[PDB]
Design a protein around this ligand. Structure first.
Ligand SMILES: [Mg+2]
Ligand SMILES: [Zn+2]
Lengths: 76, 233, 523, 835, 73, 54, 226
């Protein structure tokens, strides 16, 4: 629980995103779909629920969303 | 030669008496150049005061344990080594400490002479036993950096005088770190990150400015020879 | 040197390393070697030896003229910046002055890797045996920047580019200057004939010679990616002139362009004992471990690769290199000590820069070397920077504080290897494909990407990664509409399209429906 | 982080950068931007730190021997023409900076980038997926630095000096920050015994309970008796981790990081190893490790040793010349003599080299090397082989420091060249075994969470030697750890200890060595009664993630690779008696061994007869039936020594007892015998025991669940005998699950169902006896496969990877299975109306 | 200079990587003074290619000779 | 030495070489001489060995 | 105890290209890093002058010979690189060399315009015979450190102009010493001793002064923030 500021791709941490979901691959998909949603928004759509950045690749936006418990995933 | 990018100094506070400064962007090489100089300047070139010796009643020999007090002599020595104290006379000033009777003693129970100040008066010193007490003298003076014990006294005119290591510096810890940076398209520049941990007697900023002043004095003692053909910004 | 102190694998590797070692702009012979470089340099033949005893009449860099003792005047000619079969330079340079009286069998010029007629494949460099701040980890090595400033380990590399002009049904290829619609500046470095102009610097994609196949076309020769430099030479053959040519061909142009290459990071270095490693960090001189003379070291080698490889012969090499670069004088006032017994009466002393020889199995023993590490004449200021053990207290050029422990220092003979960077680097996003297999034209010359074999697929399947594997096997290598659509989707900014149905299946189907097999896909 | 060149990234990221150009108006038409990046104007370098921002890349080094051979990294833009690589992954990539190249792959689609960040990222692939041990741990120079930092010098400067009636302790400090101010004066060695006062570092457990009794808090003071290096080390570890105070041999570091992983997240362990490398590099440059012919020290006793042994050699040769000895027995004795001299010289060398020596420090620190090289260098190379492979009774009584003579240097080239030759055939053999192991698998994906079974295999965890203490078995971190339970633990009193469905690590081992219980039943893949694959609970915990394995994880390839990778570390054939890769190939292929041993078809006692060069055993049973016999037993194979715990049994004798499946002869039983006598489960267990014996004896740690996957797939079919009322032919090979489900769904007239007997196959036949036709059409005869498949109207369920690759469709693993592909994503209602 | 003093056991009339096993790629006590036990490539040509020693020459028949000093009494 | 221009390169050798290293690429030239009956080879043979050098 | 004595800087001469400075007294553990900062600033950034490019009558690149000259062009340039000059203008200037017939072209044979000064005119450039003629043009400029050859395609456009690697540093060798001298040991002190050796283009004093100025203007950033 006690660590230092994760940097770059290490942010957000990963042992937390694994609590939002059931496994690593569910998280992979859970983020990729949100990322495509965001890219389509930015090109044409709920868009980023979180404060974007100068580029802030849509995947990092999606993972911050997930870290804020701003989404929900139902397996298939 | 007009230098490029005019390096700047930014601060980043971490606690009350702890901070982290960042100098960026430095020409490539000027990070390790001045980092260690700054470090040693902060740690041995800012003057300050500190305990130098002590004299307790009861323990002239067998410096093991003190009557009717729970701590040994050694934990008390440490606690007082953590004592923060100023002085304005540059003289082996003397202070006293007595808390006759059981209780708990704190620097707040010290009564210092003129000028001598005590910024950490709640520091724990000892916990007296039922029907116990404490009598001690505190020798204080000024200096720079760190000085181990002094026992260059051939004969003991002051017996029971236990000399203690002396932290005359208001700065307790410093660490520097050089990191790379790109300016426009050339990386391998130098950014310098120096972290400072002081005592409540001074803020980091002030110590950094004092050290800068000292090193300016020195490199001006060098520049005074011809005063020509250097960098400019 | 010091072979019986190395192991056969590392000696094998050292041998096969010397044999791959580029010639440098300036050659320097081993301060510590074996009595075998002179004779090798003679017998090979990249030097010039006096046919007959005589007297040096004239001397230039292109001609040497000896009026012999019998009356005849021989005239040797020198090869200057001559491309080898491997891009090297074979430049020769004289080492004699006019009026000099040369015997027969005497070296009149040096070669690419000789100095006064003895192999100089490398350089003597001041080396410290120590781990630095993690930049000499797992066989990597650290360099000063004096080896770049003073172009110590700099090499010249020449390259040849040929274009043929032949006949064709549609018409005849005619090498000219003018060309279909292109820039007007690109013809700057092109002379009246369409061939690039000497003394001109060039750059990838730029034009060397102009050729055409009718239509008409722009069939000009251009520098390949990476390689660059200055036009040295043009060797042009023509049907008309009648020199010689093959069949179907009518004209030929060879271009010779050169490249001076300073030692960068990624380049490979080695010594004669099986000790190679790429260059991790090229450090400024002010952050190198310098000596109590002000003398920085030139190369830093790690301690961890020596004792598990049994190549200690380089340690002894290093020590003797010191002993030589800094001469010696045994004090025989009372008599030759108990460790100079076997020594000649010619090694009892020597000035600085005193080359020596330690033949492989009749060479410097260890008592002699430990003793000669003490004699080791003082320096300019009367101080001996190195102990009687090979170790010198050093100083850090970053902290300024001295290292707590003395460090083995010396002079070692190292070598720069043909395994450079520019000739081993590659990268691709989308380029030429095969057109016989629908895959990139795999090759450094064809600008082909890297392969993704079975074991990589295994690893990827074991990660569970399944969209990247499909991305590699379909979108990147064989698929055609996929590559197009992905390049477009990325250059436009629209999310990547998703798979349709595998295209290695939408057609395989159409082969089993041909054998009248009713293959059906169902839920 | 990875450091990537600029004129390399540029090419990789040409499209993204053309996009950011035509968007940022540095170029008008994408062709202008392509021309720009083609001549590389000075404006295509200020955006490349925008696209590179958190867009990982995959680094690959061939040969790719296992998973970690591909790893994802974040690119840091450096100038040059080489790739900057982290010194901690190299042990996984198996890299060295001596001319080694490496390949860079860029992922494009969102799914790919996410897989790279979340699965293939190096900060997460810390642990071996073979034993659970760390690979991104401190390497050579780091170990030297941390072994210098954390060691104790009795006699140093600045140490605690035992107050003497005149002065106090004299070696005591109120904080690290003060011992550092001392260090920088000369008063304190960083390796001296001192007393410090610590507030931010958690004491050990003994003291944390002996001085606080209510819970240590950050800011509470205690007084440690340590060095300053151990302190500055324990400041690299997490805030809560107890103070260690131990020399940091590589084993200790492995321990500490194992604990961090078993108790903390994995981001913390990444940060910690990063700190440790930084500090070990600092303190290796400042350690004093450097070679010099002075530092290389020669024992003085060497001469006495060599002459004492040359005396015995003289004696031998005297015999030889006297006729009491032949020309081979002589060489045998000479070898057995000059093999001990090397032992004695190495012993002396160990007892003569100080500890502050660098050549002994780099060894004993566990950084690199060993003492055999140290002997070869300062002692004596000793004996050497001929090109045949035998020995040479003339040893090498000289070191590489003294200097080998000409002949010595000649007879030492033989083995060297033999090695440089063999070292491709070795790779090829390992790769062949791996190719097989991978082909038999490709259908063992994890498909469900639990099978709801109690079936399991029993595992021993300890044994009582003196009979009053239980002794912890050695290979229990391979047999018991990481597994999942099937039966609640119980003691002689009937008290429960651990719960069912529980992971089983050191905690549970400790807490099961309490009740005197040693044999606990565990779950395994050998028993997972699942339709396709294995349940995540029978498998156990994944050794990478350290937690329970996920759904869709390809665990057959993992086992294949974990067994292949160490294959080069094994003895091989001459290019059984030498049980290395040959034995593994002899087991995974179910081959009758050369030194076959017969087993007991029955229990009971033995009547042992022996005649010239032959044994005959007769097993009189205990039930009272027909005794069996084993008659033509080559006395070459001696017998089955037992070496019982007590009494020193020795050999198997007459009147002794025999359990079923017991072995009578020393050697190697025949799997098919075991199969018919004992049964399938015991076959599987025997095979795993034998394989792991092979490996263990050769220093390789593979958790038995991999062996179990492969074995499971080797005993995964039945030969039908009596069709019953089923759509089955006799003599056919049918998969046991289909067979069970068919003869189980047949309940209508369920009075005579299909009969079948198990069959033990190999990992190459079992790959021919596959149910698909795409795979088998890619391997073997296409036209006949397609013919047979078409007359039977076959169906390919696409349960495997091979056929999915062939088609070009996703794979049924990880991010490929329906559970995941079709996940629906929606923002919450709360955070939707926040627009 | 080592290309010219090179000995090949591969080429027209020689052998190939099939027959080329591990006893032709070995060092033999008949190489002392005739073939170098060290100089040779590291990979698939280990032991086949070699290099001729410095004091050695070649019989007219084709057998390599090395010089020895003669010793009497 | 045995070479006129001999940069002095001191030696730790303790023996004397009774046989100067031969030409190092004679293995080539001698063989190509035997192939064209050059007179050097013809005499080199006659000087020791056979009588009709073929 | 405390101390009220401030540090002094005394000079000493070992040669004309060399000198030795002494700084005393100093706090203990203070002199090594001080001297190293000085040394780094010296070896790194002391303004100077060096050759920036050359041109020759007949030749067109570094890879061809000159009639009558015993040295190829690359060796000529590698001999020029050991040349020292001193320009007194923040602009590029031009030097000229002209030689005919037998004899050795040294650096003394050059014609430095006013402002420049060639401080080693006994430098061997190249020898010539009865057929040689050496006509050279040099460019000179100011800067610091090491600067690779700005390629002619990048600089002004021309042919025959040969760009070279510039080394703008008059400093040649620096080291430092620390005598832990103490005033009768009553309290430790440090004596720093810098030994400096230059290329004869400028004196040590000037170089130490330039280093001092650089470090003043640097540490002024810590000075400023109050
Ligand atoms: Mg390698
Ligand atoms: Zn199961």
């Amino acid at each position: 629980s006690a660590y230092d500021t994760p940097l770059g791709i290490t942010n957000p941490p990963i042992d937390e995103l694994l609590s939002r979901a059931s496994s690593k691959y569910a998280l992979v998909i859970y983020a990729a779909k949100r990322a495509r949603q965001i890219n389509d928004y930015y090109n044409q759509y709920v868009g980023p629920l979180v404060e974007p950045g100068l580029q802030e690749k849509p995947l990092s936006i999606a993972l911050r969303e997930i870290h804020g418990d701003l989404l929900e995933h139902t397996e298939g | 030669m007009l230098i490029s990018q005019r390096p700047t100094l930014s601060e980043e506070t971490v606690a009350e008496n702890r901070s982290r400064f960042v100098i960026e962007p430095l020409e490539p090489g000027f990070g390790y150049t001045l980092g260690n100089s700054l470090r040693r300047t902060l740690l041995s070139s800012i003057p300050g005061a500190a305990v130098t010796s002590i004299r307790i009643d009861g323990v002239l020999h067998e410096f093991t344990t003190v009557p009717g007090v729970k701590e040994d002599v050694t934990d008390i020595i440490l606690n007082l080594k953590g004592l923060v104290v100023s002085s304005d006379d540059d003289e082996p000033v003397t202070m006293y400490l007595r808390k006759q009777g059981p209780g708990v003693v704190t620097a707040g129970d010290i009564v210092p002479p003129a000028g001598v100040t005590v910024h950490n008066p709640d520091m724990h010193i000892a916990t007296l036993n039922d029907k116990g007490k404490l009598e001690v003298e505190l020798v204080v003076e000024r200096g720079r950096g760190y000085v181990p014990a002094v026992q260059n006294k051939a004969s003991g005119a002051e017996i029971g005088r236990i000399p203690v290591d002396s932290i005359y510096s208001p700065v307790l810890k410093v660490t520097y770190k050089v990191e790379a940076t790109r300016v426009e398209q050339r990386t391998d520049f130098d950014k310098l990150i120096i972290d400072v941990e002081t005592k409540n007697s001074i803020s980091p900023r002030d110590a950094l400015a004092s050290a800068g002043g000292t090193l300016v004095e020195l490199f001006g003692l060098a520049r005074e020879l011809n005063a020509d053909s250097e960098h400019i910004e | 040197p010091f072979l019986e102190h190395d192991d056969a694998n590392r000696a094998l590797m050292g041998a096969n390393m010397q044999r791959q070692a580029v010639p440098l702009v300036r050659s320097e012979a081993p301060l510590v070697g074996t009595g075998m470089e002179l004779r090798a340099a003679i017998d090979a033949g990249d030097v010039v030896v006096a046919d007959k005893t005589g007297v040096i009449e004239e001397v230039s860099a292109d001609y040497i003229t000896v009026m012999a003792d019998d009356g005849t005047r021989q005239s040797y000619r020198l090869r200057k910046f001559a491309r080898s079969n491997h891009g090297t330079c074979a430049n020769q340079r004289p080492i004699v002055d006019a009026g000099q009286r040369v015997e027969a069998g005497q070296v009149i010029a040096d070669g690419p890797c000789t100095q006064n007629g003895e192999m100089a494949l490398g350089k003597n460099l001041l080396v410290a045996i120590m781990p630095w701040e993690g930049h000499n980890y797992e066989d990597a090595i650290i360099l000063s920047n004096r080896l770049v400033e003073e172009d110590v380990l700099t090499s010249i590399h020449i390259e040849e580019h040929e274009i043929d002009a032949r006949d064709t049904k549609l018409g005849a290829e005619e090498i000219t200057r003018d060309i279909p619609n292109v820039s007007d500046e690109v013809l700057a470095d092109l002379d009246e004939r369409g061939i690039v102009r000497i003394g001109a610097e060039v750059r990838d994609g730029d034009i060397l010679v102009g050729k055409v196949t009718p239509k008409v076309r722009d069939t000009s020769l251009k520098v390949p990616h990476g390689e660059s430099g200055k036009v040295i030479g043009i060797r042009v053959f023509s049907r008309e002139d009648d020199d010689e040519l093959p069949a179907g061909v009518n004209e030929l142009v060879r271009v010779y362009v050169a490249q001076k290459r300073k030692i960068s990071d990624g380049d490979k270095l080695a010594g004669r004992h099986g000790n190679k490693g790429v260059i991790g960090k090229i450090l400024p001189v002010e952050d190198m471990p310098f000596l109590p003379d002000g003398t920085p070291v030139d190369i830093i080698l790690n301690t961890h690769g020596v004792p598990r490889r049994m190549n200690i012969g380089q340690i002894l090499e290093t020590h003797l290199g010191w002993v030589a670069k800094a001469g010696w004088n045994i004090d025989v006032a009372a008599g030759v000590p108990d460790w100079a017994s076997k020594l000649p009466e010619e090694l009892y002393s020597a000035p600085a820069d005193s080359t020596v020889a330690t033949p492989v199995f009749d060479g410097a023993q260890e008592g002699e070397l430990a003793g000669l590490l003490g004699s080791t004449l003082p320096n300019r200021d009367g101080e001996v920077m190195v102990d009687a053990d090979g170790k010198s207290t050093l100083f850090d050029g970053r902290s300024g504080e001295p290292f707590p422990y003395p460090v083995t220092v010396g002079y070692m003979y190292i070598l720069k290897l043909h395994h450079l960077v520019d000739d081993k680097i590659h990268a691709r996003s989308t380029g030429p494909y095969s057109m016989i297999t629908q895959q990139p034209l795999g090759g450094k010359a064809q600008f082909g990407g890297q392969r993704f074999g079975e074991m990589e697929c295994w690893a990827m399947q074991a990660y569970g990664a399944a969209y990247t594997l499909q991305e590699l096997l379909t979108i990147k290598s064989d698929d055609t509409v996929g590559r197009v659509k992905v390049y477009e989707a990325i250059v436009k900014g629209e999310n990547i399209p998703e798979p349709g149905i595998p295209e290695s299946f939408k057609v395989l189907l159409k082969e089993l429906q041909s054998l009248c097999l009713n293959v059906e896909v169902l839920s | 982080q990875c450091g990537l060149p600029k004129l390399m990234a540029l090419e990789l990221f040409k499209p993204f950068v053309m996009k950011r150009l035509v968007d940022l108006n540095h170029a008008q038409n994408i062709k202008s931007a392509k021309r720009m990046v083609e001549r590389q104007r000075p404006q295509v370098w200020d955006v490349l730190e925008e696209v590179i921002a958190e867009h990982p890349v995959l680094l690959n080094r061939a040969p790719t021997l296992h998973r970690l051979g591909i790893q994802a990294f974040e690119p840091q833009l450096v100038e040059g023409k080489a790739i900057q690589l982290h010194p901690l992954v190299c042990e996984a990539f198996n890299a060295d900076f001596d001319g080694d190249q490496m390949a860079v792959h860029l992922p494009l689609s969102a799914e790919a980038q996410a897989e790279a960040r979340i699965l293939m990222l190096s900060s997460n692939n810390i642990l071996s997926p073979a034993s659970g041990k760390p690979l991104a741990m401190p390497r050579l120079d780091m170990v030297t630095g941390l072994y210098y930092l954390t060691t104790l010098v009795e006699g140093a400067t600045g140490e605690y000096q035992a107050a003497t009636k005149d002065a106090p302790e004299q070696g005591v400090y109120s904080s690290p920050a003060e011992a550092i101010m001392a260090m920088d004066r000369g008063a304190l060695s960083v390796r001296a015994k001192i007393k410090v006062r610590l507030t931010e570092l958690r004491p050990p457990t003994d003291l944390e309970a002996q001085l606080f009794e209510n819970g240590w808090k950050p800011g509470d003071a205690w007084t440690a008796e340590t060095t300053l290096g151990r302190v500055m080390f324990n400041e690299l570890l997490p805030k809560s981790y107890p103070f260690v105070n131990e020399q940091m041999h590589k084993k200790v570091q492995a321990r500490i990081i194992n604990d961090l992983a078993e108790r903390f997240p994995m981001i913390v362990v990444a940060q910690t190893v990063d700190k440790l490398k930084d500090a070990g590099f600092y303190w290796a440059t400042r350690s004093g490790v450097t070679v010099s012919m002075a530092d290389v020290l020669v024992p003085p006793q060497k001469q006495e040793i060599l002459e004492r042994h040359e005396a015995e050699a003289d004696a031998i040769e005297r015999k030889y010349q006297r006729g009491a000895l032949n020309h081979t027995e002589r060489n045998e004795s000479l070898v057995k003599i000059w093999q001990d001299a090397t032992e004695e010289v190495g012993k002396a060398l160990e007892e003569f080299y100080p500890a502050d020596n660098p050549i002994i420090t780099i060894v004993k620190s566990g950084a690199t090397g060993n003492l055999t090289q140290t002997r070869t260098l300062a002692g004596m190379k000793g004996l050497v082989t001929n090109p045949k492979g035998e020995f040479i009774p003339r040893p090498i009584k000289s070191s590489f420091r003294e200097g080998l003579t000409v002949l010595e240097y000649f007879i030492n080239t033989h083995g060297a060249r033999k090695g440089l030759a063999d070292t491709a055939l070795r790779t090829a053999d390992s790769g062949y075994l791996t190719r097989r192991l991978v082909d038999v698998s490709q259908d063992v994906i994890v498909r469900e969470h639990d099978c709801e079974t109690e079936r399991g295999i029993n595992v021993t965890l300890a044994e009582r030697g003196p009979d009053g203490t239980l002794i912890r078995d050695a290979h229990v971190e391979t047999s018991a750890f990481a597994r999942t339970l099937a039966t609640d633990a119980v003691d002689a009193n009937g008290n429960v200890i651990i719960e069912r469905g529980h992971d089983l690590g050191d905690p549970a081992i400790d807490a099961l060595l309490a009740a005197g219980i040693t044999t606990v039943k565990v779950r395994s893949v050998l028993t997972c009664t699942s339709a396709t694959g294995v349940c995540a609970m029978c498998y156990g915990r994944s050794m990478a993630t350290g937690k329970l394995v996920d759904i869709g994880e390809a665990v057959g390839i993992v086992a294949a690779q974990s067994i292949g990778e160490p294959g080069t570390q094994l003895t091989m054939r001459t290019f059984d008696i030498v049980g290395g890769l040959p034995r593994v190939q002899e087991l995974f292929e179910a081959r009758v061994p050369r030194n076959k041993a017969p087993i007991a078809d029955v229990a009971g006692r033995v009547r042992l007869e022996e005649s010239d060069k032959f044994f005959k055993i007769t097993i009189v049973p205990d039930d009272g039936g027909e005794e069996v016999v084993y008659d033509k037993l080559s006395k070459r194979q001696r017998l089955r020594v037992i070496t019982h715990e007590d009494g020193t049994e020795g050999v198997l004798s007459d009147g002794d007892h025999v359990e079923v499946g017991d072995q009578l002869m020393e050697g190697a039983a025949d799997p098919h015998e075991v199969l018919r006598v004992q049964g399938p489960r015991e076959v599987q267990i025997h095979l795993v025991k034998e394989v792991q014996e092979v490996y263990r004896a050769q220093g390789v740690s593979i958790h038995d669940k991999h062996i179990e996957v492969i074995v499971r797939q080797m005993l995964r079919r039945v030969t039908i005998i009596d069709s019953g009322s089923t759509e089955f032919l006799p003599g056919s090979l049918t998969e046991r699950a289909e067979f069970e489900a068919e003869n189980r769904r047949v309940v209508a007239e369920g009075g005579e169902p299909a009969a079948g007997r198990p069959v033990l196959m190999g990992i190459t036949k079992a790959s021919l006896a596959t149910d698909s036709w795409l795979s088998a059409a890619s391997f073997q005869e296409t036209t006949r496969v397609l013919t047979d498949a078409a007359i039977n109207c076959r169906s390919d369920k696409l349960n495997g990877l091979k056929e999915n690759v062939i088609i070009g469709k996703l794979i049924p693993a990880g991010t490929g299975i329906s559970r995941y592909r079709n996940i629906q994503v929606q923002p919450t209602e709360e955070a939707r109306a926040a627009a | 200079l080592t290309h010219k003093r090179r000995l090949s056991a591969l080429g027209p009339g020689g052998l190939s990587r099939e027959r080329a096993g591990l006893e032709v790629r070995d060092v033999h006590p008949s190489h002392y003074g005739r073939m170098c036990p060290i100089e040779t490539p590291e990979g698939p040509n280990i032991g086949l290619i070699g290099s001729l020693s410095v004091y050695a020459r070649v019989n007219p028949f084709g057998f390599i000779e090395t010089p020895y000093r003669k010793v009497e009494n | 030495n045995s070479v006129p221009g001999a940069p002095n390169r001191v030696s730790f050798a303790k023996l004397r070489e009774p046989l100067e290293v031969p030409g190092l690429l004679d293995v080539q030239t001698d063989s190509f001489e035997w192939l064209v009956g050059s007179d050097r080879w013809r005499q080199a043979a006659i000087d020791r060995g056979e009588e009709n050098p073929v």
